[PDB]
Amino acid sequence: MTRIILPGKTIGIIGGGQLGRMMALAAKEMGYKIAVLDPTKNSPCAQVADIEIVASYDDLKAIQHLAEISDVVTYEFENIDYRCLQWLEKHAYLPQGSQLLSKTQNRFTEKNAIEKAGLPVATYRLVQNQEQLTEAIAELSYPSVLKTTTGGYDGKGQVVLRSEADVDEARKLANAAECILEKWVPFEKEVSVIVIRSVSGETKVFPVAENIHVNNILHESIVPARITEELSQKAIAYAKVLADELELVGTLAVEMFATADGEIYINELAPRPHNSGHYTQDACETSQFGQHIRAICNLPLGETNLLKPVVMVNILGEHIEGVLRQVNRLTGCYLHLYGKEEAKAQRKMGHVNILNDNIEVALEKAKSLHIWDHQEQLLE
Amino acid sequence: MTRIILPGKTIGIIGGGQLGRMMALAAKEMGYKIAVLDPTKNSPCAQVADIEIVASYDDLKAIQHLAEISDVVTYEFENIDYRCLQWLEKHAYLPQGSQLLSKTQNRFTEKNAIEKAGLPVATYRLVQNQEQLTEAIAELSYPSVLKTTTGGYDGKGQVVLRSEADVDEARKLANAAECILEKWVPFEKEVSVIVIRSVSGETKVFPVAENIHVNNILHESIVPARITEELSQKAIAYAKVLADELELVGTLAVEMFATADGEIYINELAPRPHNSGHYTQDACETSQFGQHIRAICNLPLGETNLLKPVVMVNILGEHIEGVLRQVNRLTGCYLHLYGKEEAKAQRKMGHVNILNDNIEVALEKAKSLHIWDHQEQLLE
Ligand SMILES: Nc1ncnc2c1ncn2[C@@H]1O[C@H](COP(=O)(O)OP(=O)(O)OP(=O)(O)O)[C@@H](O)[C@H]1O
Ligand SMILES: Nc1ncnc2c1ncn2[C@@H]1O[C@H](COP(=O)(O)OP(=O)(O)OP(=O)(O)O)[C@@H](O)[C@H]1O
Ligand SMILES: Nc1ncnc2c1ncn2[C@@H]1O[C@H](COP(=O)(O)OP(=O)(O)OP(=O)(O)O)[C@@H](O)[C@H]1O
Ligand SMILES: Nc1ncnc2c1ncn2[C@@H]1O[C@H](COP(=O)(O)OP(=O)(O)OP(=O)(O)O)[C@@H](O)[C@H]1O
Ligand SMILES: [Ca+2]
Ligand SMILES: [Ca+2]
Ligand SMILES: [Ca+2]
Ligand SMILES: [Ca+2]
Ligand SMILES: [Ca+2]
């Protein structure tokens, strides 16, 4: 379409977490008003929003209320059910649509969609009962990984199978939920690419980021990713094909495995701004949040050039004390805090973007701060 | 001092215009809360702030109310009551102080401060009646400019005397208000430098901007300024001298005139983020607004590296319709709109940062858009 949502209009956001907040901040710079729906009062996004609706995500009356006061609707919360999605796409303006969301919510459906797009993933099998598990183990051998098709996050609902000794735990998981078995990919680095596509079909792709997870939570994103030119260009090419084949509108985070000998496998997709793209706030010509707003409002997209190398480091509840105490050591460090009321140990409270001409110096800065010693030790 | 205002605390801003709005957005990214005082409801800053106080700038009890709900107070309105600042610095925390602002509020007092810092100004005389105007004209000759000592913005309260024929208009101005007459400098370029100094005395200087005015309102800022490295170094050294001699805490904008022989005359000072510093939002490692917040909260200052060449173009009320209509043509352009509810011909509604590797291509982009045909017709 050529449908444009002009500055001055209201953008409605389903989900009031940090992703919503950062969307709202970028939209405010451009003169947009913001409405947000979230089940808890005073969410990070509500602190920036003009209008706040406190309600469950599955409350259709409240979704309708959000839509009826918004000129365009988007989401950070992905688990919107079909009845709400169909209503939104037909009776509100939801340029992102429902089709991509439905593919990314189920690991089996997601992998099917990626292969149909022509892109490589780990060899996988659907597991709906004990016999399918047995057949899958015999076909894919060891090592392999069993994951729940839905609801899985932070490595939960996941069993790695290294030998027959692991089968018992795998059977327990498969007893409890629909699963997929994937062949274990021996990779060197986990990487991600944020890709943007506007309503009118303009596309932009951000640089490849190298992602380091510790205890199933992202710790650092490094840009440029420390991978060969071959791996880099391949990752970017794959992300574009995905955007094109999936008919993306908005933002798509493509998480990948990169092997020593130059292969990329697509691991999973997120149809929203993503933690591995927070680096863009300080290091790129446009942030993933500014791009997201432009894409859904059908404005011309900004450029995605990396202006300075960067290390994004996540700030969890366990880190917030150390961050405030070390505040006067934060030279070259660009702090972002989400305004969450309560710190919980593993809850994401913010992040810091460490900019430097040299990635290793940025990495050394994170270390020398001694805030993430816990994460550092687990990596050692 | 070593007083630090930590993220999570409330920053109070006196003045709800676009400068406060942009301070608030940068503060919110770092997790600060915002309170604002403005005489008009729904101001640009109130649209982002957590707390809004609607009141006059002289309403002591409202200023008192703001101080009570803030951990630190800053100003945005350059024409603030004064004495109210003397209340604030003694009974609350106003790290900027009152002394610098009071000096810059009066052109005569301003000129004295600059001269006492050892820097050049246009030769000037105080004018309080017709006899003094007559004597000043005799001494300074033509061309010269008569300016009100207080209340001058957008070229208001000024009469340029090119010949004796302009004296009649100047005489009317001199009766209306206290004025200074100064020599008219035949500069090659106008430049500005934004200098930042924190509570602990850390000092950062932004790159020199080349500024183009039309009808005494800023039209374009160009960075890097198209000047010799020698003039650039001079301008920066001048800004550091002023920051130190005026004992700056916070932001200081320094407008300068550059003549063919390579000389710099200081035109005026502004103890706040400045229109000529808006380019920093998109083109520098840190924006002037993020820097200002860091300065007053006593956090380490960010780097001021220019990450890409930029042309900032002001969007006035006369331009808003054109911007919205030509919104699809804004590739390479980073739009900021301030949320002002009422448009007036010369009122500042927003700005656009045009980023490009080549400064001349950016300048050509502004022309090709034809949004500022009026400005380009008046320039040639
Ligand atoms: N096929 C595979 N081969 C090798 N390692 C894998 C495979 N699948 C998953 N992993 C490992 O398990 C980790 C988590 O799995 P996954 O990518 O499904 O994320 P998740 O469990 O949804 O958690 P998150 O919330 O971080 O996305 C990955 O980062 C990767 O290191
Ligand atoms: N239990 C859950 N299951 C699925 N999604 C969740 C859950 N809890 C929170 N979310 C969603 O996760 C998003 C925030 O993602 P976050 O930044 O924590 O990690 P991420 O962007 O998925 O990166 P990673 O892949 O490393 O986990 C929000 O959209 C939020 O609604
Ligand atoms: N996409 C999602 N699918 C399922 N549940 C979700 C999703 N997003 C959020 N939730 C639920 O909402 C809760 C809070 O959301 P989220 O995890 O994004 O914020 P948080 O700041 O991490 O809070 P907490 O640390 O309490 O989980 C989660 O614990 C989860 O139960
Ligand atoms: N002495 C001078 N010689 C030559 N040109 C001058 C002189 N004084 C002012 N000008 C021109 O007029 C413009 C506006 O002057 P000045 O900065 O004093 O106005 P102002 O209204 O106080 O500015 P602001 O809108 O920034 O508050 C200058 O940028 C310059 O172009
Ligand atoms: Ca996942
Ligand atoms: Ca996660
Ligand atoms: Ca993931
Ligand atoms: Ca002035
Ligand atoms: Ca001026």
XYZ file of N, CA and C and ligand atoms in Angstrom, chain B residues 107 152-153 268, ligand 8:
13
model
N 22.330 41.912 27.152
C 23.406 41.992 26.153
C 24.630 42.801 26.618
N 15.431 39.855 23.398
C 15.664 39.624 21.972
C 15.811 38.163 21.568
N 14.928 37.706 20.686
C 15.051 36.399 20.027
C 14.475 36.526 18.620
N 26.855 36.045 20.684
C 26.050 35.868 21.891
C 26.261 34.492 22.512
Ca 19.217 36.104 21.691
